[PDB]
Amino acid sequence: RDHRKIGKQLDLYHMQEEAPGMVFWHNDGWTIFRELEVFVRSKLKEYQYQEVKGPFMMDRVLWEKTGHWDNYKDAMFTTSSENREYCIKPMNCPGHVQIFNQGLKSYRDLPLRMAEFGSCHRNEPSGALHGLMRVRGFTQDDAHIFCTEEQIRDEVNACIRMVYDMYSTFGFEKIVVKLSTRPDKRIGSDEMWDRAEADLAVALEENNIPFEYQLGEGAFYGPKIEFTLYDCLDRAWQCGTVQLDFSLPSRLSASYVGEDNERKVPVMIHRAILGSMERFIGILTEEFAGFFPTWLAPVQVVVMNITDSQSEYVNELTQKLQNAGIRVKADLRNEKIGFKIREHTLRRVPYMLVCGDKEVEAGKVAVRTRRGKDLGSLDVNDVIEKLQQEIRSRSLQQLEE
Amino acid sequence: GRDHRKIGKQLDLYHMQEEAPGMVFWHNDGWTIFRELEVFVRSKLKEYQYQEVKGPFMMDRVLWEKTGHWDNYKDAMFTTSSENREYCIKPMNCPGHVQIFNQGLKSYRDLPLRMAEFGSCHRNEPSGALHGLMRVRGFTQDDAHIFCTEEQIRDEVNACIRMVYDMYSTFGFEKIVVKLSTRPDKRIGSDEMWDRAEADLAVALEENNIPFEYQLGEGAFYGPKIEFTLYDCLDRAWQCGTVQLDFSLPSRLSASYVGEDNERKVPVMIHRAILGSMERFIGILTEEFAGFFPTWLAPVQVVVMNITDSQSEYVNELTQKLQNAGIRVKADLRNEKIGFKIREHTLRRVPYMLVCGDKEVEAGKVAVRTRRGKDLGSLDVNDVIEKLQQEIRSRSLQQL
Ligand SMILES: [Zn+2]
Ligand SMILES: [Zn+2]
């Protein structure tokens, strides 16, 4: 269950000292990453999110206006050009306000929900680095909701729904929740904080989610909910955040026209569910011990022959699976069937499709899993329909037989 | 009237600010086009047997000195510091791909190894030289590297050529001009090495009946290159494609593989990009089509609409059916009159707009019209989804 060990064995990624804390994603690892993105994108569509992309760097002068400069200055990478200093972004929030700022916005356009797989950089010390968990270059599944004060409650409700929806896809059911309240150094009135803390509380209570208050641990710009998941070893992983913000929009001149035809500043909600996606792949690697569910598996099916005699049956079967949209390889090497099954079991291939004479003659295929389960001979088109359904639904379970 | 800057504003594709010179903020609809272009490149990566990888945003200056590009790229690179060490923000993906190749023992059976990346790169060039999307600082090339033997060079260049013409034809670019750049004064390798490398490129083009002009002395110091230049509907030249041989970077970065005789051989590297900067290519396409993007590229492909409040439920069923077929669709159930709605999506270049009246609901049909302002009449629901699916999935330049 060591993601560094498993990552090296399965050839997912590597790290080296010429680029501390930044991942070289190999083909198979990048396949896992991309499928994770596809999954998040399907959630973004279902929950009515835009997807944008911002630039990697921005003038220090703009970062000075955010309210984050003094707190982040030591953690940012900077770079110079033509007497101007640029910060490499450690967060996507200011960039999203820049996009919001183009074109006149109305009350009609709110809530405006804006997501991004934004590659951010944080200059942490080198000794603090550790595989995929603590990295310098990271991609959060971050997003921002711009809304009215009256809309906050419904939008936190949706965020909450989206969090438990996404976590239960990977088999994470034990979730611990903390609501962090007003710090000592903060902005805004006491009744603004009363309302904001009440909206987060009521939203959790409306969904029958237990939580503990964390006194004085909120950010200066608003209160937050944090979600901590537990893996199959019962280890805690803080991942999710819903963070209200009454500072950044006004700080970066964000506005919209209300029903009463008056200029109003929108409330901002920061939300990430998985958190750092590099880290989350690390968490999944250890949760599953390298046995990634079929939909995430780099190679989903390996088709193999017993002898040279079945090679063209394997080729046709392999082409059928390519056409069905399945990540498939053909193992036509001059090796024993047991040697082929052992190698791909160790590579954690979900399904091995074995083709002997009896399978060829009947128009069938013998299905073996990486767990060692023999599901017997099955009709080829029936196996493909069942493989598709497993992938389509993102099931944790392999087929029954 | 085909300025990408104007169309990009009108269709809400992107913007740029002085706070981030030459670096694009992709809005929802612009980013949709970018990602579809990415989907298209990936289908070609699969067809032409490419791996896809992702490398780090920066690496140590000490490594960039060992590549041999330091003296040439010194002024063109963004640099940053951390813990008494200097890191260069990457202007290209070539070293990083070799670092991936250096992991795990490679043999002759692994070659040719083809490694692609949508690599986010940065170049520090004067702000006066920036022009919309055509010349930017933050760019994303459809870059790839092929690691192969000396004998395999001829076949991989052939594959690169095929991939270039295949991809340009998808967007309607048929006028292609080709240049072969030869040995400069300051260079690497023996004379017989350049005799092989130039001949490899020249013979590959000659065998394909591709006429080219020699561009004498204008190659890199580490090998010759082919350059591909396409022409838009206004007959403007855009250099996009490059196929560059490299007999230097592998050796200098300790790239090796176990040959057929069980001894360490250094592989040769083919650098290749087809679209080039994808921000720039999006720019070229925006102008080529004047915002009337082919349906597969269009940010919003279909908009379903009700004549009055009565049809509300029928629009939602039709929208869902379209969404199940894999079509980027938006229901428009506002209360602003029919012509008002049509006008708005017409001006945003939505390929198809589906009006739903009483005669259409009872008959089980839909009234289709185009962004051009052309009536296709009342047609069957399921036959329209079939027609759109073929148009989208085949990546047709033509509409119905
Ligand atoms: Zn944020
Ligand atoms: Zn290159």
Side-chain angles (χ1 to χ4, degrees), chain A residues 1-4 6-184 186-357 359-372 374-400, chain B residues 1-185 187-191 193-212 214-217 219-264 266-312 314-358 360-361 363-386 388-397 399-400:
Chain A
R1 289 185 186 276
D2 187 355
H3 72 275
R4 297 174 297 170
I6 296 161
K8 181 152 155 171
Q9 288 171 354
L10 306 190
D11 195 42
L12 305 179
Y13 76 93
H14 90 281
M15 302 270 290
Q16 59 185 81
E17 276 293 298
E18 285 81 355
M22 290 164 282
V23 185
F24 289 77
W25 286 103
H26 297 165
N27 186 68
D28 286 10
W30 191 237
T31 302
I32 296 164
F33 201 109
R34 284 187 297 115
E35 281 302 311
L36 196 64
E37 290 193 329
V38 169
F39 169 63
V40 175
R41 285 192 181 104
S42 72
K43 299 283 93 152
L44 295 179
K45 195 178 213 314
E46 188 194 316
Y47 287 84
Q48 310 98 50
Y49 280 83
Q50 297 180 12
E51 195 190 331
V52 297
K53 192 74 169 186
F56 275 83
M57 70 191 84
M58 221 152 287
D59 199 335
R60 170 173 168 175
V61 175
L62 190 71
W63 285 102
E64 286 163 356
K65 295 169 169 180
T66 62
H68 294 286
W69 177 247
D70 210 318
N71 298 307
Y72 278 83
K73 61 186 194 77
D74 302 326
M76 296 202 211
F77 289 94
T78 59
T79 182
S80 290
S81 168
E82 299 171 87
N83 311 132
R84 296 176 69 180
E85 192 166 12
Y86 296 96
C87 306
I88 309 309
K89 66 175 182 167
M91 67 188 82
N92 303 307
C93 334
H96 288 206
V97 180
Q98 299 320 284
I99 293 171
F100 184 87
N101 282 135
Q102 298 294 313
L104 188 62
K105 295 289 186 290
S106 164
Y107 77 95
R108 263 174 272 285
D109 305 311
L110 306 182
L112 195 148
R113 310 185 193 76
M114 190 184 301
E116 181 181 0
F117 303 103
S119 190
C120 296
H121 284 81
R122 60 195 170 204
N123 181 214
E124 254 110 52
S126 194
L129 299 169
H130 175 267
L132 310 179
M133 308 312 186
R134 296 185 290 284
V135 290
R136 287 201 178 171
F138 62 99
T139 314
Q140 282 200 311
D141 64 322
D142 207 299
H144 290 85
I145 306 160
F146 297 82
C147 65
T148 68
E149 293 91 331
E150 288 72 31
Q151 288 166 343
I152 293 161
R153 201 165 292 191
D154 288 321
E155 294 300 302
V156 174
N157 256 254
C159 288
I160 287 161
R161 188 80 68 181
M162 198 175 192
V163 169
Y164 285 89
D165 197 345
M166 283 182 58
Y167 291 161
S168 61
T169 296
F170 305 95
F172 298 129
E173 291 296 341
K174 187 179 170 190
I175 309 298
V176 171
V177 190
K178 309 294 182 212
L179 201 166
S180 293
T181 55
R182 64 196 75 192
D184 231 302
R186 72 188 180 255
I187 51 105
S189 61
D190 289 342
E191 53 253 48
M192 193 207 76
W193 280 88
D194 289 336
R195 285 194 304 280
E197 287 169 1
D199 287 347
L200 299 180
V202 172
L204 291 167
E205 283 159 359
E206 279 185 344
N207 287 302
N208 194 30
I209 294 159
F211 70 100
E212 295 179 7
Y213 284 107
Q214 268 191 343
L215 307 187
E217 273 291 339
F220 69 85
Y221 49 87
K224 61 175 175 184
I225 309 169
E226 289 173 325
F227 298 87
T228 299
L229 62 84
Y230 286 70
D231 64 18
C232 66
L233 294 172
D234 206 27
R235 305 178 301 179
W237 297 98
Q238 198 266 302
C239 287
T241 305
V242 175
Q243 165 77 75
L244 304 178
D245 193 337
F246 307 94
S247 184
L248 194 65
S250 182
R251 276 276 199 153
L252 297 179
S253 308
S255 63
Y256 72 98
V257 185
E259 298 207 66
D260 59 349
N261 208 57
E262 285 182 40
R263 177 180 272 256
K264 300 176 184 290
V265 181
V267 177
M268 168 167 286
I269 306 169
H270 304 224
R271 130 265 171 280
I273 299 158
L274 308 183
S276 175
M277 290 179 69
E278 289 86 356
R279 176 167 167 276
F280 196 77
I281 290 158
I283 293 163
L284 295 182
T285 311
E286 305 198 339
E287 168 57 28
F288 301 127
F291 294 78
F292 292 102
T294 302
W295 72 276
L296 284 171
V299 173
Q300 299 174 312
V301 180
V302 174
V303 193
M304 52 190 69
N305 57 332
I306 297 176
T307 57
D308 186 71
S309 188
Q310 303 95 29
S311 69
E312 305 312 293
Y313 190 77
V314 171
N315 287 341
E316 181 176 292
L317 197 45
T318 300
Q319 187 59 68
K320 274 157 140 47
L321 287 152
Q322 296 271 31
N323 295 1
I326 292 160
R327 296 190 286 284
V328 63
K329 307 294 169 187
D331 188 8
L332 305 170
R333 292 176 296 165
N334 188 15
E335 293 287 356
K336 300 181 83 170
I337 190 66
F339 189 86
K340 297 184 179 177
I341 289 166
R342 278 191 296 279
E343 190 179 315
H344 293 115
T345 295
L346 194 62
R347 251 293 206 284
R348 307 283 177 247
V349 172
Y351 294 96
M352 286 156 285
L353 267 59
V354 182
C355 294
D357 286 347
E359 286 75 42
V360 176
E361 288 157 19
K364 291 184 179 178
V365 68
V367 186
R368 323 299 186 78
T369 66
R370 64 196 164 182
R371 298 263 167 235
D374 181 21
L375 286 78
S377 292
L378 299 169
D379 181 72
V380 162
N381 293 1
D382 190 50
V383 173
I384 292 161
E385 289 169 341
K386 287 178 166 189
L387 282 168
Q388 283 178 323
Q389 167 51 32
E390 191 180 332
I391 294 163
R392 207 198 335 277
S393 64
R394 297 191 179 78
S395 178
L396 293 161
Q397 314 307 125
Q398 297 196 240
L399 295 172
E400 297 172 30
Chain B
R2 66 189 55 229
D3 187 9
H4 65 271
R5 301 168 187 90
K6 185 61 168 191
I7 295 160
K9 188 81 177 194
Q10 285 172 319
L11 311 194
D12 201 28
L13 303 181
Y14 79 96
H15 85 283
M16 285 169 122
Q17 304 184 345
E18 279 295 305
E19 288 84 4
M23 291 173 290
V24 181
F25 290 81
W26 289 103
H27 291 183
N28 179 237
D29 292 7
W31 188 237
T32 301
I33 298 170
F34 196 111
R35 287 185 295 114
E36 279 301 303
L37 187 54
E38 229 164 45
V39 168
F40 171 68
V41 171
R42 285 187 178 116
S43 67
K44 300 292 168 191
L45 294 176
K46 191 182 186 192
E47 189 184 345
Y48 290 76
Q49 312 268 327
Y50 281 84
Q51 298 175 203
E52 198 192 327
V53 300
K54 189 71 166 185
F57 189 71
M58 66 188 75
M59 302 199 208
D60 198 332
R61 188 192 143 167
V62 174
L63 181 51
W64 288 101
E65 289 177 323
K66 288 166 187 170
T67 60
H69 310 295
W70 180 247
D71 295 65
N72 301 46
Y73 282 81
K74 253 158 68 187
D75 303 343
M77 286 196 215
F78 286 99
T79 64
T80 184
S81 286
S82 163
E83 305 175 52
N84 312 310
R85 302 219 305 170
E86 192 166 16
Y87 297 89
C88 303
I89 292 167
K90 68 176 183 179
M92 65 204 199
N93 307 296
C94 326
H97 287 207
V98 180
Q99 303 308 291
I100 293 168
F101 185 93
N102 291 133
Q103 294 294 122
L105 185 54
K106 298 288 190 293
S107 78
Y108 75 92
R109 276 161 286 183
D110 296 314
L111 308 176
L113 199 160
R114 312 191 191 76
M115 189 182 295
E117 177 180 1
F118 299 101
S120 320
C121 294
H122 288 80
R123 56 190 173 226
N124 180 29
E125 68 206 323
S127 61
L130 302 174
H131 310 281
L133 299 176
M134 305 314 177
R135 193 64 176 177
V136 305
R137 286 194 177 165
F139 64 101
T140 309
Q141 286 205 341
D142 63 323
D143 194 39
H145 292 81
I146 301 150
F147 299 87
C148 67
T149 67
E150 281 78 355
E151 297 93 61
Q152 289 168 339
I153 293 164
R154 295 282 253 260
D155 310 82
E156 296 300 304
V157 172
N158 268 76
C160 288
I161 293 160
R162 289 191 168 86
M163 202 177 196
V164 171
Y165 285 84
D166 190 12
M167 285 180 67
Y168 295 162
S169 285
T170 307
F171 310 98
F173 301 125
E174 302 303 322
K175 192 185 189 217
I176 312 298
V177 168
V178 188
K179 313 282 189 181
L180 203 166
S181 302
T182 62
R183 65 190 81 175
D185 297 334
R187 87 192 187 251
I188 284 160
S190 62
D191 294 16
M193 197 169 288
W194 286 85
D195 290 343
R196 292 174 183 85
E198 292 172 9
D200 289 350
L201 296 174
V203 172
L205 292 167
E206 285 168 358
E207 274 176 18
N208 283 275
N209 301 121
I210 292 161
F212 65 99
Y214 276 109
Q215 202 159 61
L216 293 150
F221 70 89
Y222 48 86
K225 58 175 186 178
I226 303 169
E227 284 183 332
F228 297 91
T229 299
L230 61 86
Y231 282 78
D232 61 21
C233 60
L234 304 179
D235 211 57
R236 296 177 298 180
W238 304 99
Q239 192 276 315
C240 297
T242 302
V243 175
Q244 160 85 58
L245 272 46
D246 196 346
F247 301 84
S248 179
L249 189 59
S251 177
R252 296 184 114 270
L253 293 177
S254 311
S256 61
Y257 70 100
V258 180
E260 206 159 311
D261 66 336
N262 297 311
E263 278 174 34
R264 256 48 165 75
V266 177
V268 301
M269 222 191 306
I270 298 167
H271 302 218
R272 131 269 171 272
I274 299 165
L275 276 33
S277 169
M278 282 167 78
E279 293 81 1
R280 177 172 173 273
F281 201 83
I282 285 160
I284 293 157
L285 294 179
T286 307
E287 303 214 356
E288 173 64 15
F289 299 123
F292 292 81
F293 289 102
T295 305
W296 70 278
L297 280 169
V300 179
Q301 301 175 315
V302 183
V303 167
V304 192
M305 340 186 79
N306 60 329
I307 292 181
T308 179
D309 214 319
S310 185
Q311 291 90 6
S312 293
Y314 187 67
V315 169
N316 293 334
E317 285 180 22
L318 191 58
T319 302
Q320 188 64 60
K321 280 179 168 183
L322 290 155
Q323 197 184 335
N324 293 345
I327 299 171
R328 292 189 291 282
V329 60
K330 279 181 190 173
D332 189 21
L333 298 165
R334 303 175 295 177
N335 56 309
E336 268 168 320
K337 288 169 160 173
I338 302 90
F340 185 102
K341 297 172 166 182
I342 295 284
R343 179 169 82 252
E344 209 170 71
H345 305 290
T346 296
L347 191 54
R348 286 175 77 91
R349 317 310 184 189
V350 176
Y352 300 98
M353 288 152 287
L354 272 50
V355 182
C356 296
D358 295 320
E360 288 79 4
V361 172
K365 292 190 176 183
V366 66
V368 189
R369 65 160 73 193
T370 69
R371 61 196 167 182
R372 300 291 187 182
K374 191 160 65 65
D375 194 37
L376 298 174
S378 188
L379 281 162
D380 182 45
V381 169
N382 295 310
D383 216 317
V384 171
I385 280 77
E386 284 170 21
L388 292 165
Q389 275 186 244
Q390 182 159 349
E391 195 185 331
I392 290 161
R393 293 184 185 177
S394 69
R395 302 196 170 81
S396 178
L397 288 162
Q399 281 185 270
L400 266 60

